C-alpha cells in the first residue's frame, strides 16, 4: 500500500482599492422583551437572547482563504 | 504500509488600500428587558443575555487564511 | 509501517494601507434589565448578562493565521 | 514502526501602514440592573453580569498567528 | 518503535506603522446595579459582576503568535 | 349711562378617584438631526427646536377652571 | 356716568384621591444633534434648542384656577 | 365719573390624597450636540441650547390660583 | 372724578395628604457638547447653555397664589 | 378727583402632610464639553454654562403668595 498526498496551491488571493467613502451608520433604538422560563442547553450550543447588537464592519478589504485536509483509515 | 504527505501551500493572501473614509456611527440608544426563571447549561455553551454591544471594527484591510491536516488511523 | 508528514507552507499574508480615515463613534446610551432566579453553568461555559459594551477596534490592519496538525493512532 | 514528522512553516506575515487617524470615540452613559437569586458554576465558567465596558482598541496593526501539532497514541 | 519528531518555523510575523493619530475616548458615565443573594462558584470560575470598565488599549503594533507541541502515549 | 355688572358664578368643579394603578412609560431612543442657518424670530415668539423629552403626567384627579372678566370702554 | 363692577364668584374646585399605584419612567436614550449658524431673538421670546429633559410630573391632585377683571377706559 | 370697583371672590381650591406609591425614574443618558457660530439676543429673551436636564416633580398635591385686577384711563 | 376701588379676596387655596411614598430618581449620565463662536446678550436676558442639571423636586403639598392689582392714569 | 385705593385680601393658603417617605437620588454622572470665542453680556443678563448640578429639593410642605399693588399717574 502506498500513498503519496501532493496537493499544491500556489493561487493568490488579491483585493486593491482607492479610497472607500463616507460611510454613515445612524440607526434609531429599539426596545426589545423576552419572557420565558426554562432554558436548558447542552453540548455546543451558543446563542444570543434579548439584544441590539448594531455592528458597523469595514475592512479596507479583505479575503478568506479556507483549507482542509484529511485522510481517514 | 507507505504514506507519503507532503502537500505545498505558496499561496499568497494580499489587500491595497488608498485610504478609507470618514466613517460615522451613530445610533439611538435602545432598551431591553428580559425575564426568566432557570438556566442550565451543560458542556461548552456560550450566551448573551440582555445586550446592547454596539460595535465598529475598521480594520486597515484583513485576511484569514485556516488550515487544517489531520491523519487518523 | 512508514509515516512521512512534511507538509510546506510559505504563504505569505500581507496588508498594506494608506491612511485610515476619521471615524466617530458616538452611540446614545440605552438600558438593560434582567430578572432571572437560578442559574446552574457546568464545563465550559462562557456568558455575558446585562451589559452594554460599545467596542471600537481599528486595527491597522491585520490579519490571522491558523494552523492545525495532528495524527492520532 | 516509523513515525516521522518534519512540518515546514515559512510563512511571513506583514502589516503595514501609513497613518491612522483622527478616532473619536464618544458614547452616551446607560444603565443596567440585573435581578437574580442563585448561581452556580462549575468548571471552567467565565461570566460578565451587569456591566458597561466601552472599549476602544487601535492596534497599531496586528496579527495573530495559531499553531497547533499533535500527536497521540 | 522510532518517532522523530522535527518541524520547523521560521515564519515572521511584521507590523509596521507611520503614526497613529489623534484618539479620543470620551464616554458618558452610567449606572449599574447588582441584586443577588447566593453565589457557589467550583473549580476554575471567574467573572466580572458589577462594573464600569472602559478601556482604551493602543498598542503600538503588535503581534501574538501560539504555538502548542503535544505528544501523548 | 348706569352700568351695572355683578354676575355671580358658584358652580362647583370636582373630581373623585379610588386609586389609579400602576403606570409604565418606557419608550426606546430616537435621533434628531436638526440643520438650519438662520433664524429670526419677533415680539412674543416661542419655539422648541430638536427635542426628545419625554413626559410622564399623572395628576391625581386635576381640574382647570378659567374665567374673564372684562368691560371697557 | 355710574359704573358699578361687583361680580362675585365663590365656587370651588375640588381634587380627592385615595391612592395613585407605582409609577415607572424608563426611556432609553436618544441623540440630538442640532447645526445652525445665525439666530437672531428679539422683544418677550422664549426658546429650547437641543434638549432630552424627560420629565416626571406626579401631583397628588391638582388644580388650577385663573380669573381675569380687567376694566379700562 | 363714579367707579366703583368691588369683586368679591371667596372660592375655594382644595386638594385631597391618601398617599401616591411607589415612583420610579429610570431613563438612560443620551447625547447632545449643539453646533452654531453667532448668537443675537435681545429684550426680555429666554433660552436653553443643549440640555439634558431631567425632571422629577412630585408634589404632595397642589393648587395654582392666579388673578388679576386691572384698572385703566 | 370718583374712583373706588375694593376688592375683597378671602378665597383659601389648601392641599392635605396622608403620605407620598418611595420615590427613586436613578437617570443615567448623558454627554453634552456645543460649539459656538460669537454670542451677543442685551437686556433682560436669561440663558442656560450646557446643562445636565437633573432636578428631584417633592414639596410635601403645595400651592401658588399670585395676585396683581394695578390702577393707572 | 378723588382716588380711594383699599382692597382687602384676607385669604389663606394651607398645606399639610402626614409624611413623605424615602426619597433616593442617584444619578450617574456625565460629561459636557464647551467652546466658544466672544461672548458679550449687557444690561440685566443671567447665565448658566456648563453645569452638572443636581438639585434634590424637599421642601415639608411650601407655599408661595406674591402680591403687587402698583397705582401710577
Same mark, same amino acid.
Given at each position: 500500500?502506498?500513498?503519496?498526498?501532493?496537493?499544491? *496551491?500556489?493561487?493568490?488571493? %488579491?483585493?486593491?482599492?482607492?479610497?472607500?467613502?463616507?460611510?454613515?451608520?445612524?440607526?434609531?433604538?429599539?426596545?426589545?422583551?423576552?419572557?420565558?422560563?426554562?432554558? *436548558?442547553?447542552? *453540548?455546543?450550543?451558543?446563542?444570543?437572547?434579548?439584544?441590539? *447588537?448594531?455592528? %458597523?464592519?469595514?475592512?479596507?478589504?479583505?479575503?478568506?482563504?479556507?483549507? %482542509?485536509?484529511?485522510? %481517514?483509515?
Amino acid at each position: 500500500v502506498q500513498i503519496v498526498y501532493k496537493p499544491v *496551491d500556489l493561487s493568490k488571493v %488579491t483585493s486593491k482599492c482607492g479610497s472607500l467613502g463616507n460611510i454613515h451608520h445612524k440607526p434609531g433604538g429599539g426596545q426589545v422583551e423576552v419572557k420565558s422560563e426554562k432554558l *436548558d442547553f447542552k *453540548d455546543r450550543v451558543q446563542s444570543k437572547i434579548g439584544s441590539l *447588537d448594531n455592528i %458597523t464592519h469595514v475592512p479596507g478589504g479583505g479575503n478568506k482563504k479556507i483549507e %482542509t485536509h484529511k485522510l %481517514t483509515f
